[PDB]
mmCIF file of N, CA and C in Angstrom:
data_model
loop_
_atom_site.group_PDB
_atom_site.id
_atom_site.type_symbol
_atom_site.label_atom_id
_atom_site.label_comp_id
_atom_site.label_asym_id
_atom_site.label_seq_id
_atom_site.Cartn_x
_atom_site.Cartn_y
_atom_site.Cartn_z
ATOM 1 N N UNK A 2 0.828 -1.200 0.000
ATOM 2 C CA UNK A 2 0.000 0.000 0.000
ATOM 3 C C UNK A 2 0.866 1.255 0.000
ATOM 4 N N UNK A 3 1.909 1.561 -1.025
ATOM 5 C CA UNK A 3 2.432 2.583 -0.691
ATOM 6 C C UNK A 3 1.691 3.502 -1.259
ATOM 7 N N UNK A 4 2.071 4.759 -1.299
ATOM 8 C CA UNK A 4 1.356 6.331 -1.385
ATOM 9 C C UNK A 4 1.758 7.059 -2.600
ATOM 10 N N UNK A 5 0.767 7.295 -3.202
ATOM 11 C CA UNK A 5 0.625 7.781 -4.939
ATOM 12 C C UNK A 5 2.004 8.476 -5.310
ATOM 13 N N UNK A 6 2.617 9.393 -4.390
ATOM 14 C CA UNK A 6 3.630 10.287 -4.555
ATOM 15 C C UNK A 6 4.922 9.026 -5.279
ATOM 16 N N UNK A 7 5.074 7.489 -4.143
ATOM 17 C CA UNK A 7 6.118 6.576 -4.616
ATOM 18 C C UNK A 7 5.343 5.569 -5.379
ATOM 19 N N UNK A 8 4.566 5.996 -6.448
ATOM 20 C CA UNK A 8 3.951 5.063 -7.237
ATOM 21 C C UNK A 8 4.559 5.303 -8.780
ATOM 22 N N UNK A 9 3.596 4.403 -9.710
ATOM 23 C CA UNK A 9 4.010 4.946 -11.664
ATOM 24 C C UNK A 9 4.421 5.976 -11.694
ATOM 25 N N UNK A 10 3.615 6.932 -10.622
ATOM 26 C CA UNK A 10 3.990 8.663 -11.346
ATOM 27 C C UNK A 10 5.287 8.640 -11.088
ATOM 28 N N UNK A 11 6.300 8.771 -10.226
ATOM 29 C CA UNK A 11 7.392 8.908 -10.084
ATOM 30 C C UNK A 11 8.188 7.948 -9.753
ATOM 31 N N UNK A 12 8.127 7.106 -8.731
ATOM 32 C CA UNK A 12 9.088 6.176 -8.142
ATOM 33 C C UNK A 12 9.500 4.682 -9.154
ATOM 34 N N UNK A 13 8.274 4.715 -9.972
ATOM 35 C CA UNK A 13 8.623 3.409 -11.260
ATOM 36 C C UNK A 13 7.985 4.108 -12.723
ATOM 37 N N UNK A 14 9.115 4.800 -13.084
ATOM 38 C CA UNK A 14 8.759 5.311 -14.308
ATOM 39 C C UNK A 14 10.084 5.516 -14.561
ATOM 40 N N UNK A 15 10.513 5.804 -16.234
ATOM 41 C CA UNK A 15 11.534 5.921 -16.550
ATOM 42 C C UNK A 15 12.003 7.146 -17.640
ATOM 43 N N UNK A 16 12.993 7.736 -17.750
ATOM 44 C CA UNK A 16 12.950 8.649 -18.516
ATOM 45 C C UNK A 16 13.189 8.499 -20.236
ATOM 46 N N UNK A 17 12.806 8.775 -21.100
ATOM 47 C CA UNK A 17 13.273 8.897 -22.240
ATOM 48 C C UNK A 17 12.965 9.875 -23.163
ATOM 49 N N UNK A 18 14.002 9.923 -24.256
ATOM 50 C CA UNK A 18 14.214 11.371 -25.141
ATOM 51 C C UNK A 18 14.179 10.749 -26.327
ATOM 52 N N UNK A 19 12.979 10.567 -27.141
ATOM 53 C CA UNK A 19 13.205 9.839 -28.087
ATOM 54 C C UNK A 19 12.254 11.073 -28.843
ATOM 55 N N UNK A 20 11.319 11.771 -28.135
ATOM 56 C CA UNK A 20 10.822 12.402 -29.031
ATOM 57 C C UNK A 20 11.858 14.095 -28.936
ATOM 58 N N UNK A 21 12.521 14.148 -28.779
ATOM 59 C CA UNK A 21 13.652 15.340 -28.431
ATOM 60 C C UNK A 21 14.282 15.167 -30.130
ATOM 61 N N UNK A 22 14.155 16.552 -30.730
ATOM 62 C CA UNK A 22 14.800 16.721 -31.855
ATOM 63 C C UNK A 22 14.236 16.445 -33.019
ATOM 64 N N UNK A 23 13.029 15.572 -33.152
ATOM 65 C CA UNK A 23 12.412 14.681 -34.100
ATOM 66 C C UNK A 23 11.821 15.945 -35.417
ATOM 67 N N UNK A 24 10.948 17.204 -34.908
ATOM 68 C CA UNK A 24 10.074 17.692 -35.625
ATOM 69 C C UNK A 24 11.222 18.553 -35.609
ATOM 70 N N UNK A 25 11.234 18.708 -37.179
ATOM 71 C CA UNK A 25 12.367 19.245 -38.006
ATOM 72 C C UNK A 25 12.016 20.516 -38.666
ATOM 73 N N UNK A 26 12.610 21.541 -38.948
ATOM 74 C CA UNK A 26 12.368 22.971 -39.425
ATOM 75 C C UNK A 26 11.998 22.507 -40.704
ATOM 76 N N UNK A 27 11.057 23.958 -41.377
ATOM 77 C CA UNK A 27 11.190 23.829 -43.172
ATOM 78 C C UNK A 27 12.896 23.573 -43.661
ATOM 79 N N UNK A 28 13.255 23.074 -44.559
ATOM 80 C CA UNK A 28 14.271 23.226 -45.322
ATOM 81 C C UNK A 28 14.389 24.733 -46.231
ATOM 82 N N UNK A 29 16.037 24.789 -45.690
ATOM 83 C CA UNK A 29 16.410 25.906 -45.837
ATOM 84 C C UNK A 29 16.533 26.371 -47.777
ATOM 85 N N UNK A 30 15.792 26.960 -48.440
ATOM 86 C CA UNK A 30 15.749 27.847 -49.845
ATOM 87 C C UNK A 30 16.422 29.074 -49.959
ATOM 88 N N UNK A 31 16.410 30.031 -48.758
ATOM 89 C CA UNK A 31 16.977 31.014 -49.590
ATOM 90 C C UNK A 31 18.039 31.281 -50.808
ATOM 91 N N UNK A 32 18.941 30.067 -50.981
ATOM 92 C CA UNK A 32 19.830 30.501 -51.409
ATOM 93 C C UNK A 32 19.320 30.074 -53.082
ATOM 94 N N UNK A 33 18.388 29.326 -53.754
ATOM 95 C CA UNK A 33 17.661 29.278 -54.552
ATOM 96 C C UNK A 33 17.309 30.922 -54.927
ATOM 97 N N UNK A 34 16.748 31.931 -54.178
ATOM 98 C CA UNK A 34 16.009 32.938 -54.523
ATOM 99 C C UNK A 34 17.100 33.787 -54.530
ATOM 100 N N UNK A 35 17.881 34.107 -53.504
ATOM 101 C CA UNK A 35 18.733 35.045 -53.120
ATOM 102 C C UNK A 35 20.258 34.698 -53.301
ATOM 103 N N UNK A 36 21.338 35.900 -53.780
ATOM 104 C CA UNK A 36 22.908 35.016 -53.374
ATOM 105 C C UNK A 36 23.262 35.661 -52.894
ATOM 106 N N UNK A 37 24.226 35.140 -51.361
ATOM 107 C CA UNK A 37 25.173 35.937 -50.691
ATOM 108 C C UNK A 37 26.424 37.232 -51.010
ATOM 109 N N UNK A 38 26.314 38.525 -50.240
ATOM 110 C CA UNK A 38 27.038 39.277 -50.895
ATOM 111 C C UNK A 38 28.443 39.586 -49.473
ATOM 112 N N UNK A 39 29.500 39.477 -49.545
ATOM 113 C CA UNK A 39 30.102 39.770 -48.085
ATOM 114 C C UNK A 39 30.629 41.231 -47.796
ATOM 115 N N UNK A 40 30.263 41.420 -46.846
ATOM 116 C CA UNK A 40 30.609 43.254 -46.289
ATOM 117 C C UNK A 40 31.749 43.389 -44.904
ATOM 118 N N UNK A 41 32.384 44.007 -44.573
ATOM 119 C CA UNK A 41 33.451 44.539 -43.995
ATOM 120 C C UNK A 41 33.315 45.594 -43.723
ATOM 121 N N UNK A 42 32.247 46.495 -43.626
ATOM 122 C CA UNK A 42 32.362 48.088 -43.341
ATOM 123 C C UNK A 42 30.635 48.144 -42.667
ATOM 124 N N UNK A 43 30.301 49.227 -42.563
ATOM 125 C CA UNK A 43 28.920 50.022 -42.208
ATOM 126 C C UNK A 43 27.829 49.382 -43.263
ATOM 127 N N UNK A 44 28.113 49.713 -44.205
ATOM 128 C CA UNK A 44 27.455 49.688 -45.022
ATOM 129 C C UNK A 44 28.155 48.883 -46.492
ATOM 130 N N UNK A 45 27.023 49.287 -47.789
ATOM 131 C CA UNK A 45 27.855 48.856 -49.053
ATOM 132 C C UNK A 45 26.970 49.554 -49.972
ATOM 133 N N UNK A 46 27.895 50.107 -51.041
ATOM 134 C CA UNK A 46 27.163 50.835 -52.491
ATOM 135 C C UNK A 46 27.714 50.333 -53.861
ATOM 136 N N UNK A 47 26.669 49.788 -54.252
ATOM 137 C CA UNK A 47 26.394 49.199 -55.836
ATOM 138 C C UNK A 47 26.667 50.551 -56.531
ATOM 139 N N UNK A 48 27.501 49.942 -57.718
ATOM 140 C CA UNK A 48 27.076 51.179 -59.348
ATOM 141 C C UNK A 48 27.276 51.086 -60.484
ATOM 142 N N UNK A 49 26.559 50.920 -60.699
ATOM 143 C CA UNK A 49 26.932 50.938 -62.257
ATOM 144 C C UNK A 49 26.135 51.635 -63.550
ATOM 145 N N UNK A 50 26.694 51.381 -64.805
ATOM 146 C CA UNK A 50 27.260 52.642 -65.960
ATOM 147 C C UNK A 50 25.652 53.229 -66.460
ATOM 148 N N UNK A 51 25.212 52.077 -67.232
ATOM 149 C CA UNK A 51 24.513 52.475 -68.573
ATOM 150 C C UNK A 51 24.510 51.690 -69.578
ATOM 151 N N UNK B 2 66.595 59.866 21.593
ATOM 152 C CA UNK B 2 65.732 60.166 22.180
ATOM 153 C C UNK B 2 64.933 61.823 21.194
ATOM 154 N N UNK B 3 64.192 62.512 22.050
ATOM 155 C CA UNK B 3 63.372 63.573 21.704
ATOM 156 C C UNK B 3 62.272 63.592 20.126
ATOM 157 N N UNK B 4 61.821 62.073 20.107
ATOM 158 C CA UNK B 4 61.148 61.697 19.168
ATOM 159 C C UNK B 4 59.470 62.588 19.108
ATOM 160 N N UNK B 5 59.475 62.486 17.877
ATOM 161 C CA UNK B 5 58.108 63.391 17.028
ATOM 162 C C UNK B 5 57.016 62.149 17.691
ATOM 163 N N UNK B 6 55.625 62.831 17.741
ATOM 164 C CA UNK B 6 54.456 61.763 17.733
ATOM 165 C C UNK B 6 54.750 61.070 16.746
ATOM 166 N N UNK B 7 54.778 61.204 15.133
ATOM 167 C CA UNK B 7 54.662 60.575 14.213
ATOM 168 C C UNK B 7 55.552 59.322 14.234
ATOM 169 N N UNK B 8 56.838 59.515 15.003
ATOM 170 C CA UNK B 8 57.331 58.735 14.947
ATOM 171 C C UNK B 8 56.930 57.522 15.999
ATOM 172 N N UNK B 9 56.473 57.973 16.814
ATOM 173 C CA UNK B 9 56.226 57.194 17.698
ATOM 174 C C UNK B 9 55.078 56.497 17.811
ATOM 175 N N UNK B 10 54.050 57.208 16.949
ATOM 176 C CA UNK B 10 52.369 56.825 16.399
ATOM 177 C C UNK B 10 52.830 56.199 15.221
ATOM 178 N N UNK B 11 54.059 56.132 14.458
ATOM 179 C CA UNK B 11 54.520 55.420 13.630
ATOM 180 C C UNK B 11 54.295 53.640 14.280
ATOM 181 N N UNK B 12 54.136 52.988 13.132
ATOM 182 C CA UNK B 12 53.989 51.426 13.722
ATOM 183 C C UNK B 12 55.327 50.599 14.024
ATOM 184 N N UNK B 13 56.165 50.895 14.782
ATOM 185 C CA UNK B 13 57.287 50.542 15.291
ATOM 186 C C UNK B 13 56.909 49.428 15.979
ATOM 187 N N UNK B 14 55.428 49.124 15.790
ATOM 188 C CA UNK B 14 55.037 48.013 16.623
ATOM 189 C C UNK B 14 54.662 46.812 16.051
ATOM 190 N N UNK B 15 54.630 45.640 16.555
ATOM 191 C CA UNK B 15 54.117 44.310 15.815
ATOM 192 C C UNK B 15 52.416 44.040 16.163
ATOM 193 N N UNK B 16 52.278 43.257 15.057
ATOM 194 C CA UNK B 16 51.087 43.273 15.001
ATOM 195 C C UNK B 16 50.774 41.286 14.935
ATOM 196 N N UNK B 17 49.753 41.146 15.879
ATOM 197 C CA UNK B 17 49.536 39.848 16.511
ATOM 198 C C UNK B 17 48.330 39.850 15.844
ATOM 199 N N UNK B 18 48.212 38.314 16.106
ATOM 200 C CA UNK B 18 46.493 37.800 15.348
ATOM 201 C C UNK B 18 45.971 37.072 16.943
ATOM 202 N N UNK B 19 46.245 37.636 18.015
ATOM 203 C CA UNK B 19 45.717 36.552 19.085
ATOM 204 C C UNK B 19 44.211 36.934 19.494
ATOM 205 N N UNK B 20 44.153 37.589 18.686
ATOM 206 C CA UNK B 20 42.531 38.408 19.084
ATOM 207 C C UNK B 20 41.770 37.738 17.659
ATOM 208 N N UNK B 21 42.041 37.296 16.863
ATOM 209 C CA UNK B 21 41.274 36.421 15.942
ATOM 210 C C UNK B 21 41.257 35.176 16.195
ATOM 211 N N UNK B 22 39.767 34.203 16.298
ATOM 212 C CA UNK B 22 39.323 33.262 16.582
ATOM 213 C C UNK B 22 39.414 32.932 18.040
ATOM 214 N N UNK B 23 39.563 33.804 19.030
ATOM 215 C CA UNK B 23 38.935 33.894 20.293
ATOM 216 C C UNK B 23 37.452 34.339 20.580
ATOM 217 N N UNK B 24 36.702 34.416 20.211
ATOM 218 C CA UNK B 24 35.396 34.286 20.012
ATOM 219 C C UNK B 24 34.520 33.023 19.002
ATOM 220 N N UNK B 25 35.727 32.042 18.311
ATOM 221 C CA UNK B 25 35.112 31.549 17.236
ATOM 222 C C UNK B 25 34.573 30.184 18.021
ATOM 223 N N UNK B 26 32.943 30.389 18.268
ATOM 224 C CA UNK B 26 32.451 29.323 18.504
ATOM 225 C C UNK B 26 32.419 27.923 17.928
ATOM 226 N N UNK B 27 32.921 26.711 18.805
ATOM 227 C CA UNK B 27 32.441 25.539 18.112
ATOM 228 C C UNK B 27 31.081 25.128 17.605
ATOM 229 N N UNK B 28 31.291 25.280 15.980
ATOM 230 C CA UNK B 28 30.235 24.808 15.244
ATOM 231 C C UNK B 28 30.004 23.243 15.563
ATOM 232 N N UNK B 29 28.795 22.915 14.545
ATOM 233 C CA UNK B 29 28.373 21.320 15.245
ATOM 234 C C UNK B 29 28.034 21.052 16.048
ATOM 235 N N UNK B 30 27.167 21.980 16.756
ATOM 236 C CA UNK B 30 26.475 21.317 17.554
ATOM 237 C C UNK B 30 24.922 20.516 17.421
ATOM 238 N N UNK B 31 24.844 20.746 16.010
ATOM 239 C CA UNK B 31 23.310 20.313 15.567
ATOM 240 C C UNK B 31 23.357 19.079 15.212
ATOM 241 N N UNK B 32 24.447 18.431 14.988
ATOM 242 C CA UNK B 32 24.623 17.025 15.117
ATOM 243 C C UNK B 32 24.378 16.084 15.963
ATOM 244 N N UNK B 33 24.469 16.654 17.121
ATOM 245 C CA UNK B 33 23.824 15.979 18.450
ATOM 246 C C UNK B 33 22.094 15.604 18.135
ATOM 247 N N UNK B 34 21.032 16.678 17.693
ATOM 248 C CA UNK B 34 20.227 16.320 17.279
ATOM 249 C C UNK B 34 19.713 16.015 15.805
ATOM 250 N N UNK B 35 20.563 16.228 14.710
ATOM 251 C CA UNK B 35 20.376 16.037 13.609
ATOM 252 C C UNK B 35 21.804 15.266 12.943
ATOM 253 N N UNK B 36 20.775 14.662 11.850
ATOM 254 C CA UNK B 36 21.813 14.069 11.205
ATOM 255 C C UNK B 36 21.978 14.104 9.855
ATOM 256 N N UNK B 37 22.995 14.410 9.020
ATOM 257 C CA UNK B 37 23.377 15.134 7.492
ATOM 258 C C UNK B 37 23.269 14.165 6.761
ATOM 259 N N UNK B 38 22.274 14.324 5.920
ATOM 260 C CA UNK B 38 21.819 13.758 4.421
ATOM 261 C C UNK B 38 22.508 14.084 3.001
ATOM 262 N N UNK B 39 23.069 13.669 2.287
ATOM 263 C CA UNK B 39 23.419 14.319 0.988
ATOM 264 C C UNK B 39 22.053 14.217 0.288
ATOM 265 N N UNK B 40 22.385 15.399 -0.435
ATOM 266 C CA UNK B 40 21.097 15.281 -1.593
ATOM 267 C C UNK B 40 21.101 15.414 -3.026
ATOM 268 N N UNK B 41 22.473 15.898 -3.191
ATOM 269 C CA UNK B 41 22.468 16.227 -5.206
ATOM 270 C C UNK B 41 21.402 15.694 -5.278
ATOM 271 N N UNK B 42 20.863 16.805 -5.421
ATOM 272 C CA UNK B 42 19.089 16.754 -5.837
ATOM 273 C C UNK B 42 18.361 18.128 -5.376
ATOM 274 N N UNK B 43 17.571 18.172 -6.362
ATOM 275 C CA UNK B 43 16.467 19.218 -5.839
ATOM 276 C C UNK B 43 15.510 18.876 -5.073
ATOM 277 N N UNK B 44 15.408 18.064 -4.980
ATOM 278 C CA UNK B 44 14.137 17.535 -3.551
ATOM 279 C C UNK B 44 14.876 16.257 -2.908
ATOM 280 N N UNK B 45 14.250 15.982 -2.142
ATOM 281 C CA UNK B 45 14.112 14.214 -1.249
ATOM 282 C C UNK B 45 12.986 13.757 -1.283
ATOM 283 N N UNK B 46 13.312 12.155 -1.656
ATOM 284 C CA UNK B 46 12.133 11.156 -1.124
ATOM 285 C C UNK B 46 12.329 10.322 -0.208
ATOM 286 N N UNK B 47 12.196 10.168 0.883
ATOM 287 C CA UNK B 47 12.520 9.063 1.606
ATOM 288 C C UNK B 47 10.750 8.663 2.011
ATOM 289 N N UNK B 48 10.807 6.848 1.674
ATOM 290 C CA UNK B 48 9.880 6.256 1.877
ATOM 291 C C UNK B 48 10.063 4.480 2.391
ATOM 292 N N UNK B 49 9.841 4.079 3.721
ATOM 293 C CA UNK B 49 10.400 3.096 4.173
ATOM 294 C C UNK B 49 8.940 2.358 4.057
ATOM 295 N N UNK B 50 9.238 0.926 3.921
ATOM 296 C CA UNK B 50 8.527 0.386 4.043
ATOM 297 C C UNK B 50 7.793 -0.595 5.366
ATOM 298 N N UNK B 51 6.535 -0.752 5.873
ATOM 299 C CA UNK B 51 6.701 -0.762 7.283
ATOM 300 C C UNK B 51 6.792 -1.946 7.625
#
């Protein structure tokens, strides 16, 4: 007759992580639409002619 | 001889520690009625069976 507190709920139960990590982000596109440009300063200015 | 205060309020003197831990009560005395559990843990269960 022990007492609910040392029962299934806690005292005989076990831990597991199986659902940890599973549901996965959209897959990453940008680089389909967009292409990387690299900067070193404040800012950056495009130019061109005509 | 015919020394300045300063010199003499100067610390020409030694300096003792016999006045530290003359007041330092013996700890432990709660051991007499209690007794130390480890717990790494955020709670305790203790549950005996009768």
């Amino acid at each position: 007759a022990i007492i609910t507190p040392a029962l299934i709920s806690a005292l005989k139960t076990s831990f597991q992580k199986h659902f940890q990590d599973a549901l996965a982000t959209a897959p990453s596109t940008y680089l389909q639409v967009a292409t990387v440009i690299p900067s070193t300063t404040a800012s950056n200015t495009y130019g061109w002619l005509g």
